[PDB]
């Protein structure tokens, strides 16, 4: 049982965008399919539903007339075409299965996909710039010195930061992103290590920004 | 309602004929010589007809070359008990066939596995003088074949037991069919009497056949697979094609649709392929319900219809009806009930097997009788 | 359409406590209500349907009650994997299937002895200066409690309105916090001064600790 | 599709189209034979138990054949 969704991205307000969701592992041709969105940090919002045969479509009031749902049982797909997008439509969209099979009354969602993120903000997509926050040379001989990376000026969220491709996890703090005054995001990832380890072990932070297909490996040296 | 119009006929006349032909001098020796080589052979009978012949069980070989040599050798002392079980095998079939023929007086209406196994039945079907489509159809639905075929015990002599398995032929295949469901259609006035009821009597199956329509009034004597309708042309009337017009317009001059008139204000429910018709009259409670949500519709007085999508149960008074959950598309053709076109004072209060022209003409008779005074 | 309200907006309870959350509808939805549990950063999982029918596989500690307009969800012994958000959703007769506002459920803050923050200061890199922007970073590491004051002083002049703070969540191992204050200036403004300092005041510190660096 | 149904409220009647036909229209007879043995009456000592079981089975077989002959 699996629902794989695709078609997300960033789209300027007023434009169109089509989401698709393919199903595998169950008799897709007999289940009603729901689309349910969730704003970042807010609750769940029901969007639409389509019956098993595809001849009964229901839309929420906030998306009525704009969104349109369709299904294809020969390929086990559900499509949600959203045109004339407002900024309030920026959210993560799940396709979900209706619990009860072969009915014209819709009850609830029991199998949820992973989701597709849809951002409407008029700002464009920019990959991040990674700058090294180098350890100070005053660091005591002991000494527990600290270094890190600054992931700056990226849009939209999120970026994922690892260290040494995952080999370094202890003492790592990746802060939550902040919305800079520029309308772009920026965060920092810091690591505290014994000062006697500097100049001995290579320290590299790996930054990943999927919305821009950006993979950066930044080496941090004193 | 038109089950009485059918003619009567002998069902096993062909098998009995082949049996009477099997009693002729030399016909059983002919079949035995034909089956001397293999277990299946086509034999031209003295009646002209060529039939397939099967040797489904060989006991003479086993008894006479595997059991009697070992038994009556020196003093019939047996050394192993696996021989007893090996003889209980290869003999259960003959005993069960004997029992089946004894209880059914020599002719069984469904052909059992004892009479003919599925492998033997498929081998017989595949070597029949029929088209490949008929072979495929019979091979896919062997159970319906067994249900619609007979086994007539024919003869036992010359060390051979013979019975004729009389199989269907399925001459007409893949032509379009349609079922017609009917329900009483009455008026809805609040008076206890003076309430006229009209019903259609042509309910049952219909199939296109050689430019005509084979109509089956006893729809219970028709089996239904996924969407294939197995019926017997003997349980059928033959009508012109124009009868289908009774669905597009019931007052057409070409064909006269048989109806039924009564004055019985009884609530009923007729479950169709994809939904249910509800004739709700009087003070009866009529309800449409979903399995997970309870009652979802209350029926007003009259003849209404609901689809099987979302509706899983129809209750009329104290009777409960489960609707067929078969997939399909339903359509509701809005129109005025025909019963509102007649005068309650001139309406014929009782006629079982009538028609539109007959009832309409009898109305003229009664109106002329009333107007003369 | 039907309006659904959940109570409480959020709650904080220890492991093993009996937690009872409420859901209310504007009208009669008699028993057409589901409860979903969305784990942090996961997909919503269906906890129960028809307001009492547990879904197969859900631990028996969850119990749904109520009807008409009022329903309750009860966890007899709250567990670690029970944190997250809980959503009630009605499916009364031909959608819109409205959801609820949700209910946040978190474990209590695991009180730790007071710990003073380790304070570091990072000047802007040369590569970042090549692009015309300077970002000085003041880092506070491994402190409890979450309250702390971080001020910026450039040439002994107090800064205001050009710094952004970001704080991590409480660590799962030592139950401490970390904070980063980033001060962003133009390259010309950064080159127009000499010494940069961040001063931190906090319960675990005897004196406000100031960490500074001279440009160069 | 594959099946449709129309309800005429005019005459309170439903029609279910989309089915396919399989009409009998005739018969096909076929002779099926079972080769039997007319084993002659044995005469041996029924001292063994397995031989008694074999004798019972032979009695069952002969009685079935005798019913079949007597069923005409
Ligand atoms: C009934 O009414 C008149 C008889 O005067 C005629 O026009 C009509 O054809 C009659 N129908 C019959 C006799 O079936």
Short mmCIF file of N, CA and C in Angstrom, two decimals, chain B residues 203-271:
data_model
loop_
_atom_site.label_atom_id
_atom_site.label_comp_id
_atom_site.label_asym_id
_atom_site.label_seq_id
_atom_site.Cartn_x
_atom_site.Cartn_y
_atom_site.Cartn_z
N UNK B 203 -42.81 -8.89 -17.50
CA UNK B 203 -41.55 -8.98 -16.79
C UNK B 203 -40.81 -10.26 -17.16
N UNK B 204 -39.48 -10.18 -17.15
CA UNK B 204 -38.65 -11.32 -17.47
C UNK B 204 -37.53 -10.94 -18.41
N UNK B 205 -36.92 -11.95 -19.02
CA UNK B 205 -35.75 -11.74 -19.86
C UNK B 205 -36.14 -11.59 -21.33
N UNK B 206 -35.30 -10.87 -22.08
CA UNK B 206 -35.49 -10.69 -23.51
C UNK B 206 -34.14 -10.77 -24.20
N UNK B 207 -34.06 -11.53 -25.30
CA UNK B 207 -32.82 -11.61 -26.06
C UNK B 207 -33.12 -11.58 -27.55
N UNK B 208 -32.28 -10.88 -28.31
CA UNK B 208 -32.41 -10.87 -29.76
C UNK B 208 -32.02 -12.23 -30.33
N UNK B 209 -32.82 -12.73 -31.26
CA UNK B 209 -32.60 -14.07 -31.81
C UNK B 209 -33.23 -14.13 -33.19
N UNK B 210 -32.38 -14.17 -34.23
CA UNK B 210 -32.82 -14.37 -35.61
C UNK B 210 -33.91 -13.36 -36.00
N UNK B 211 -33.62 -12.08 -35.77
CA UNK B 211 -34.55 -11.02 -36.11
C UNK B 211 -35.77 -10.93 -35.23
N UNK B 212 -35.98 -11.87 -34.31
CA UNK B 212 -37.09 -11.85 -33.38
C UNK B 212 -36.56 -11.65 -31.97
N UNK B 213 -37.44 -11.73 -30.98
CA UNK B 213 -37.06 -11.61 -29.58
C UNK B 213 -37.52 -12.86 -28.85
N UNK B 214 -36.57 -13.60 -28.29
CA UNK B 214 -36.90 -14.69 -27.38
C UNK B 214 -37.15 -14.09 -26.01
N UNK B 215 -38.37 -14.27 -25.50
CA UNK B 215 -38.79 -13.71 -24.23
C UNK B 215 -38.96 -14.85 -23.24
N UNK B 216 -38.41 -14.67 -22.05
CA UNK B 216 -38.48 -15.69 -21.00
C UNK B 216 -39.28 -15.12 -19.84
N UNK B 217 -40.52 -15.58 -19.63
CA UNK B 217 -41.33 -15.01 -18.54
C UNK B 217 -40.89 -15.50 -17.18
N UNK B 218 -40.51 -16.77 -17.07
CA UNK B 218 -40.01 -17.33 -15.82
C UNK B 218 -38.52 -17.02 -15.74
N UNK B 219 -38.22 -15.79 -15.31
CA UNK B 219 -36.84 -15.35 -15.20
C UNK B 219 -36.06 -16.14 -14.16
N UNK B 220 -36.75 -16.86 -13.27
CA UNK B 220 -36.05 -17.69 -12.30
C UNK B 220 -35.37 -18.88 -12.97
N UNK B 221 -35.88 -19.32 -14.12
CA UNK B 221 -35.26 -20.42 -14.86
C UNK B 221 -34.23 -19.90 -15.84
N UNK B 222 -33.43 -18.93 -15.40
CA UNK B 222 -32.34 -18.36 -16.19
C UNK B 222 -31.20 -18.06 -15.23
N UNK B 223 -30.04 -18.64 -15.49
CA UNK B 223 -28.89 -18.37 -14.65
C UNK B 223 -28.11 -17.20 -15.24
N UNK B 224 -27.44 -16.45 -14.37
CA UNK B 224 -26.71 -15.26 -14.79
C UNK B 224 -25.29 -15.35 -14.26
N UNK B 225 -24.32 -15.25 -15.16
CA UNK B 225 -22.92 -15.13 -14.80
C UNK B 225 -22.59 -13.64 -14.73
N UNK B 226 -21.30 -13.28 -14.79
CA UNK B 226 -20.87 -11.89 -14.69
C UNK B 226 -21.78 -10.94 -15.48
N UNK B 227 -21.88 -11.15 -16.80
CA UNK B 227 -22.94 -10.49 -17.56
C UNK B 227 -23.52 -11.40 -18.63
N UNK B 228 -23.31 -12.71 -18.52
CA UNK B 228 -23.81 -13.67 -19.49
C UNK B 228 -25.08 -14.32 -18.94
N UNK B 229 -26.10 -14.43 -19.78
CA UNK B 229 -27.41 -14.92 -19.38
C UNK B 229 -27.63 -16.28 -20.04
N UNK B 230 -27.59 -17.34 -19.24
CA UNK B 230 -27.89 -18.69 -19.72
C UNK B 230 -29.38 -18.95 -19.52
N UNK B 231 -30.10 -19.09 -20.63
CA UNK B 231 -31.52 -19.42 -20.60
C UNK B 231 -31.77 -20.61 -21.51
N UNK B 232 -32.95 -21.19 -21.38
CA UNK B 232 -33.36 -22.33 -22.18
C UNK B 232 -34.44 -21.87 -23.15
N UNK B 233 -34.18 -22.05 -24.45
CA UNK B 233 -35.15 -21.61 -25.46
C UNK B 233 -36.48 -22.32 -25.31
N UNK B 234 -36.52 -23.44 -24.58
CA UNK B 234 -37.77 -24.16 -24.37
C UNK B 234 -38.66 -23.46 -23.35
N UNK B 235 -38.06 -22.76 -22.38
CA UNK B 235 -38.81 -21.95 -21.42
C UNK B 235 -39.02 -20.54 -21.95
N UNK B 236 -39.52 -20.41 -23.17
CA UNK B 236 -39.55 -19.10 -23.81
C UNK B 236 -40.68 -19.01 -24.82
N UNK B 237 -41.17 -17.79 -25.00
CA UNK B 237 -42.01 -17.40 -26.12
C UNK B 237 -41.16 -16.68 -27.15
N UNK B 238 -41.67 -16.62 -28.38
CA UNK B 238 -41.01 -15.94 -29.48
C UNK B 238 -41.89 -14.80 -29.97
N UNK B 239 -41.38 -13.58 -29.88
CA UNK B 239 -42.15 -12.37 -30.13
C UNK B 239 -41.48 -11.53 -31.22
N UNK B 240 -42.22 -10.61 -31.84
CA UNK B 240 -41.58 -9.68 -32.77
C UNK B 240 -40.67 -8.71 -32.04
N UNK B 241 -39.73 -8.13 -32.79
CA UNK B 241 -38.78 -7.20 -32.18
C UNK B 241 -39.47 -5.94 -31.68
N UNK B 242 -40.57 -5.53 -32.32
CA UNK B 242 -41.28 -4.31 -31.97
C UNK B 242 -41.75 -4.29 -30.52
N UNK B 243 -41.73 -5.43 -29.83
CA UNK B 243 -42.09 -5.47 -28.42
C UNK B 243 -41.20 -4.54 -27.61
N UNK B 244 -39.94 -4.35 -28.04
CA UNK B 244 -39.05 -3.46 -27.30
C UNK B 244 -39.59 -2.04 -27.25
N UNK B 245 -40.42 -1.66 -28.23
CA UNK B 245 -41.03 -0.33 -28.23
C UNK B 245 -41.84 -0.09 -26.96
N UNK B 246 -42.33 -1.15 -26.32
CA UNK B 246 -43.05 -1.00 -25.06
C UNK B 246 -42.25 -0.24 -24.01
N UNK B 247 -40.94 -0.10 -24.21
CA UNK B 247 -40.13 0.68 -23.28
C UNK B 247 -40.02 2.14 -23.70
N UNK B 248 -39.90 2.41 -25.00
CA UNK B 248 -39.75 3.80 -25.43
C UNK B 248 -41.09 4.53 -25.43
N UNK B 249 -42.18 3.84 -25.74
CA UNK B 249 -43.52 4.42 -25.66
C UNK B 249 -44.52 3.29 -25.51
N UNK B 250 -45.34 3.37 -24.47
CA UNK B 250 -46.25 2.29 -24.11
C UNK B 250 -47.61 2.40 -24.77
N UNK B 251 -47.89 3.50 -25.47
CA UNK B 251 -49.15 3.68 -26.19
C UNK B 251 -48.97 3.59 -27.70
N UNK B 252 -47.83 3.08 -28.16
CA UNK B 252 -47.56 3.03 -29.59
C UNK B 252 -48.53 2.08 -30.29
N UNK B 253 -48.90 2.38 -31.55
CA UNK B 253 -49.85 1.52 -32.26
C UNK B 253 -49.25 0.24 -32.79
N UNK B 254 -47.93 0.13 -32.88
CA UNK B 254 -47.31 -1.03 -33.51
C UNK B 254 -47.49 -2.28 -32.65
N UNK B 255 -47.02 -2.24 -31.41
CA UNK B 255 -47.12 -3.38 -30.51
C UNK B 255 -48.04 -3.06 -29.34
N UNK B 256 -48.76 -4.07 -28.88
CA UNK B 256 -49.71 -3.95 -27.78
C UNK B 256 -49.11 -4.61 -26.55
N UNK B 257 -48.78 -3.80 -25.54
CA UNK B 257 -48.11 -4.31 -24.36
C UNK B 257 -49.11 -4.91 -23.39
N UNK B 258 -48.88 -6.16 -22.99
CA UNK B 258 -49.76 -6.82 -22.05
C UNK B 258 -49.59 -6.23 -20.65
N UNK B 259 -50.72 -5.92 -20.01
CA UNK B 259 -50.74 -5.33 -18.69
C UNK B 259 -51.71 -6.11 -17.81
N UNK B 260 -51.90 -5.62 -16.59
CA UNK B 260 -52.77 -6.23 -15.60
C UNK B 260 -53.41 -5.12 -14.77
N UNK B 261 -54.71 -5.23 -14.54
CA UNK B 261 -55.44 -4.26 -13.75
C UNK B 261 -55.96 -4.91 -12.48
N UNK B 262 -55.94 -4.16 -11.39
CA UNK B 262 -56.44 -4.63 -10.11
C UNK B 262 -56.84 -3.42 -9.28
N UNK B 263 -57.36 -3.69 -8.08
CA UNK B 263 -57.72 -2.63 -7.15
C UNK B 263 -57.13 -2.88 -5.77
N UNK B 264 -56.03 -3.63 -5.72
CA UNK B 264 -55.41 -4.02 -4.45
C UNK B 264 -54.30 -3.03 -4.12
N UNK B 265 -54.50 -2.25 -3.06
CA UNK B 265 -53.56 -1.20 -2.67
C UNK B 265 -52.55 -1.78 -1.69
N UNK B 266 -51.61 -2.55 -2.22
CA UNK B 266 -50.61 -3.25 -1.43
C UNK B 266 -49.24 -2.71 -1.77
N UNK B 267 -48.47 -2.36 -0.74
CA UNK B 267 -47.11 -1.86 -0.94
C UNK B 267 -46.16 -3.01 -1.21
N UNK B 268 -45.28 -2.82 -2.20
CA UNK B 268 -44.37 -3.87 -2.64
C UNK B 268 -43.03 -3.26 -3.00
N UNK B 269 -42.02 -4.12 -3.11
CA UNK B 269 -40.70 -3.72 -3.56
C UNK B 269 -40.16 -4.76 -4.53
N UNK B 270 -39.62 -4.30 -5.65
CA UNK B 270 -39.06 -5.16 -6.68
C UNK B 270 -37.61 -4.76 -6.89
N UNK B 271 -36.69 -5.66 -6.53
CA UNK B 271 -35.27 -5.38 -6.64
C UNK B 271 -34.78 -5.76 -8.03
#
